[PDB]
Amino acid sequence: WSSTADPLSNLVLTFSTKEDAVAFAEKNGWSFDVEERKVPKPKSKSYGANFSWNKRTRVSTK
Amino acid sequence: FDNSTYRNLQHHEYSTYTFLDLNVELSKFRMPQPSSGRQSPRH
């Protein structure tokens, strides 16, 4: 079996904002590293672009 | 003037290449085609 020796292996905490997580970590005395949120960029979708007269976006099959 | 006869009898002697032979003959009468600007969408 898979044995461990640290009690915090399964400890995961959930917060609504990053500031709350930072405050919790600071008040508990843990040193932290924070990663900023990665949000997908807004995309420009056009169905008609699949059938362009002169552009490269015209598809070859559906 | 008559109506007892059937006039569409030419299609009784059409071969397998009649349509494409007609297309070849008509090729000389067509206007120049427009160009999209590229050779293909994959170019």
User: Could you give the 3-state DSSP secondary structure of residue B3?
Assistant: coil
**Terminus-to-terminus CA distance in chain A, angstroms?**
50
Helices (H), A1-62: 18-28
Q: Shortest Cα distance from B8 to chain A (angstroms)?
A: 41
Is residue A49 within 8 A of residue A57, CB to CB? The reply is yes
Is residue B15 within 8 A of residue A32, CB to CB? The reply is no
Is residue A53 within 8 A of residue A59, CB to CB? The reply is no
Kindly report the backbone phi and psi dihedral angles of residue A50, in degrees, each rounded to the nearest multiple of 5, phi listed first: -65, -15
Resolution in A, one decimal? 2.6
Cα A6 → chain centroid: 27
Q: Shortest Cα distance from B6 to chain A (angstroms)?
A: 46
Cα–Cα distance for residue pair B17/A61, rounded to 1 Å: 30
